[PDB]
Design a binder for this molecule. Structure first.
Ligand code: NA
Length: 258
């Protein structure tokens, strides 16, 4: 979970233009303004319906969120785009507060960023990197509400399959809105078609103003099949009494590659 509200160390770098970020890069989320550290780069196909879907390779990052700006599925663990990263420099030998931080990074003033992969991390990257080939990135805009979805395959355990999903919601306008209802359609490979219509997202009814323009949450979906496609609508309410359905662009839930 995270809304956008306020921030508060370091020196600010220039966002990179023709280069990927390095393991150990400290950054603030350019939207949620948390303190984070880069773990490794990851190339995802991005299906952005707002070029008007011939998906283009785009550099994403697995990342550790500082536990002071927060409370497979590890708590401080998150994915951010290249654009999400405002890079910066500290000289704290502990710049990010998180249980995984020391396990993954050795401090060492030799190099920049000044934190190196503990080989605990290289094993982790090698373990995770395959499964992430199952994570495409979907984004579509309706009525100045931009939706981003990434599915992540959790594993399996009759035979049941688990995905988590990041959804981000962004008000691009100044007009105030609030998420009120979700209406999921989940269509399995079995030909089962589940549906879900309810108040809010994970307990929340987020208000999106240019004072708090963005919300990101994580939830999970279960099938009794190797694969399926999922899509739906969020219903938003305006102060003027009106309401509109923001499309969640279709994404896919996968287990095998070929
Ligand atoms: Na370097």
């Amino acid at each position: 979970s995270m809304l956008s509200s306020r921030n508060r160390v370091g020196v600010f770098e220039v966002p990179k233009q023709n280069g990927k970020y390095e393991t150990g890069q400290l950054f603030l989320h350019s939207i949620f303004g948390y303190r984070g550290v880069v773990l490794f780069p990851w190339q995802a196909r991005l299906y952005d319906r707002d070029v008007a879907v011939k998906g283009k390779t785009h550099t994403y990052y697995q990342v550790l969120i500082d536990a002071r700006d927060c409370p497979y599925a590890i708590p401080g663990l998150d994915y951010v785009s290249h654009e999400d990263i405002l890079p910066y420099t500290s000289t704290d030998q502990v710049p990010i507060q998180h249980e995984l931080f020391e396990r993954f990074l050795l401090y060492d003033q030799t190099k920049a960023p000044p934190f190196v992969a503990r080989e605990t991390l290289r094993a982790w990257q090698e373990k995770n990197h395959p499964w992430l080939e199952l994570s495409d990135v979907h984004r579509e805009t309706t009525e100045n509400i931009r939706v981003t979805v990434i599915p992540f395959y959790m594993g399996m355990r009759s035979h049941v399959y688990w995905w988590r999903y990041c959804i981000r919601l962004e008000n691009l306008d100044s007009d105030v809105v609030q998420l009120r209802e979700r209406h999921w359609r989940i269509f399995s490979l079995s030909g089962t078609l589940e549906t879900v219509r309810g108040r809010g997202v994970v307990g929340r009814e987020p208000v999106l103003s240019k004072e708090q323009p963005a919300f990101q949450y994580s939830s999970h979906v279960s099938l009794q099949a190797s694969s399926g496609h999922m899509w739906g609508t969020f219903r938003f309410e305006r102060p003027d009494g009106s309401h509109f359905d923001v499309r969640i662009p279709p994404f896919s839930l996968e287990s095998n590659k070929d």
